[PDB]
Amino acid sequence: FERMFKEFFATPMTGTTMIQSSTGIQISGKGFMPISIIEGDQHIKVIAWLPGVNKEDIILNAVGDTLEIRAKRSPLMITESERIIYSEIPEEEEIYRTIKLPATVKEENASAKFENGVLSVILPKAESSIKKGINIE
Template sequence: MKWPAKRSVSGPARWDPFEEIRRTQERLNQLFEDFMPMEEWGGGKVYTPAIDIMEEDDKLVVTTDLPGINKEDVEINLKEDMLEISAKTGEEKETEEEGYLRKERAYTQFYRAVRLPVGVKEEGSTAKMENGVLTISLPKAQIEEPKKKIEIE
């Protein structure tokens, strides 16, 4: 059976509600990706949380949201002028139904590395976790410049 050829209809295009839903879904997906980007990996998702860095007189205060993460599962590393925050959480469910045994695992990982705007020192640094918000306080490094002697000609 041969279908009739499509006719070109001049005038305004017809509104397609399904196309509108598809475009709205794409915009929502992009908003979620911008807010908390993630990528799939072998057993779960990797989230890149937003980080706030505030400069106070003698320290930097870094905050980030890590919802559902226990403080024991968070690792913070300081390498020169890079701050690295990573956390992993997971759960396993085992169900047995009429001869079937099913075991499912879901893991979520958070990872973020940022270059700090000023030098900091590890000594005196603190971190605390409250209600899913990680706050890190990093004392600024005092850089002492050696005195330079100027010779008189």
């Protein structure tokens, strides 16, 4: 019966509770917020999809190796004559993600951008987490 739900393509609504994730990193939180972690040698780039969110409704906090993204998207306002006959868009207003990074970061030098509903965060690595090349042979 679990395929039957997959055949409905209700996946964005029901199947997005990000209680946990294990890939060497820990992601927890509530709501729909797809994440991409890009690791460089000197920095970390985090990409979060926040469609329908205004820049001012984003709380972006970091310390050490943990990053917090808190956001609220206003729900779709409808006049009384109007009615939602079809919707795949999640109704959850308050969403947040807590990302445990693999590396310690300098939050004082971090930067972020919000374009087209995409948040791009630049997190410089702390020197303690900057790796060093082992010379081969």
